[PDB]
């Protein structure tokens, strides 16, 4: 029992590490989505012309490319975290006996699953649609970060008890 509790605390700290890396990656994605929201609100200006709209949209596309890059690049050593490999969670045995374990779940977050990979700003309806999808993406990232934070709190209590 003593030896198993030692190894289980090691596994619990591994789980905290994974969750902390993924949660930190999602913050830059939130930041870039806020920037795109400002660009979209700026597109609704009856003094812009087609060249100004093209400049605004070029920066939107670069931001969506960086959201996708963060989505595919984040890793723990060589295993990817935000691409869908944890969509059905992985178990970490945090105790000495079989079945005493905690599940860590992360879903994919990139410009394709967030539905921000094809936004337009050249028409009034296109701007309205882009605003709604950016707001929805911000909401889903908030929900994912909430679940990862709950997992970290739980693992802290469990290590203390062990």
């Amino acid at each position: 029992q003593v030896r198993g509790l030692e190894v289980g605390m090691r596994n619990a700290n591994d789980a905290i590490s994974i969750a902390q890396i993924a949660e930190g990656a999602m913050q830059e994605q939130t930041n870039m989505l806020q920037r795109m929201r400002d660009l979209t609100v700026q597109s609704e200006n009856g003094a812009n012309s087609s060249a100004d709209l093209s400049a605004l949209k070029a920066e939107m596309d670069q931001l969506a490319n960086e959201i996708d890059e963060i989505g595919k690049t984040t890793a723990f050593g060589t295993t990817k975290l935000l691409a869908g490999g944890f969509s059905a969670g992985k178990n970490f045995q945090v105790g000495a006996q079989d079945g005493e374990d905690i599940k860590v779940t992360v879903k994919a977050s990139n410009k394709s699953s967030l539905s921000v990979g094809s936004l337009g700003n050249t028409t009034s309806a296109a701007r309205a649609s882009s605003l709604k999808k950016i707001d929805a993406a911000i909401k889903t990232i908030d929900a994912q970060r909430a679940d990862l934070g709950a997992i970290q709190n739980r693992l802290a209590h469990n290590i203390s008890n062990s």
């Binding site: 591994d14 590490s17 902390q20 890396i21 930190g24």
Partner: protein, 54 residues
Amino acid sequence: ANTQANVADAKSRIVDVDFAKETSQMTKNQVLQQTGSAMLAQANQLPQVALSLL
């Protein structure tokens, strides 16, 4: 920069030593060395009962 900080934390959890635990183990083995030395020195004097019988 964020990811570098988190990954260095993760690696430190695996590779680095804990001073609070390791100093305790060191002191325990020090005391055991002194006790075992005393006990072996006392053990090498057992064949001298024969000289008494002799």
